[PDB]
């Protein structure tokens, strides 16, 4: 490992992330689930990148040719441990849901990428394109309330089916999420996030690790 300080490059940081399911139980009353968050300039150790490229899709425009582009130091795995204990009331109260915030001292027009991988392969992109609100001296991207797509929703339920949190690690050895932001106009990587997933052992809580990419 090479720990060294730089998820965020210079040019753009996430501030917030998370994962939500939030239930109405009646019109003034809603509970709301976090399955992951983040946020809610450190010195990063470090992977090789070369041991995640066959996690995700690696021919034109894949995880490999996107690294080899650059900048490296937007470059980052994510390793989270998500809290699955929640109820999952099959209803029209129910909203999956992902909420991130990202900051520049630029003004820019941002498109984030989304990909959903099964045993490294594409299986779902949501793409999303932000504009910038100025903001305590800064630019804020914020996407709120984004909708999961239905095949993220019925993994959850999935995973939540089984009755042991190590049979749901097995599955979600083969479940990534590559988040791809860019600058729509200039086509430049201002951070990518190679995410990867086991279940929290805590009853009531979601862990991440965030690890810098490097080369070699």
Do not use: M, N, P
């Given at each position: 490992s090479h720990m060294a300080s730089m998820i965020g490059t210079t040019k753009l940081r996430l501030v917030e992330f998370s994962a939500f399911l939030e239930q109405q139980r009646d019109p003034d009353s809603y509970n709301k689930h976090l399955f992951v968050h983040i946020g809610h300039d450190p010195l990063l150790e470090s992977v090789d990148?070369?041991?995640?490229?066959?996690?995700?899709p690696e021919k034109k425009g894949g995880?490999?040719?996107?690294?080899g582009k650059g900048p490296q130091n937007a470059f980052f795995l994510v390793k989270f441990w998500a809290d699955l204990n929640c109820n999952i009331q099959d209803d029209a109260?129910?909203?999956?849901?992902?909420?991130?915030?990202?900051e520049s001292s630029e003004n820019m027009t941002v498109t984030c990428s989304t990909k959903v991988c099964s045993f490294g392969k594409q299986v779902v992109e949501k793409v999303e394109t932000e504009y910038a609100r100025f903001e305590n001296g800064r630019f804020v991207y914020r996407i709120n309330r984004s909708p999961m797509c239905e095949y993220m929703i019925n993994f959850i339920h999935k995973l939540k089916h089984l009755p042991e949190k190590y049979m749901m690690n097995s599955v979600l050895e083969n479940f990534t999420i590559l988040l791809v932001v860019t600058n729509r106009d200039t086509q430049e990587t201002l951070l990518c996030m190679a995410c990867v997933f086991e279940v929290s052992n805590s009853e009531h809580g979601a862990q991440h690790h965030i690890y810098r990419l490097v080369k070699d």
């Open positions: 990148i070369r041991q995640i490229y066959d996690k995700f995880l490999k040719e996107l690294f109260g129910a909203f999956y849901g992902v909420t991130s915030q990202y």
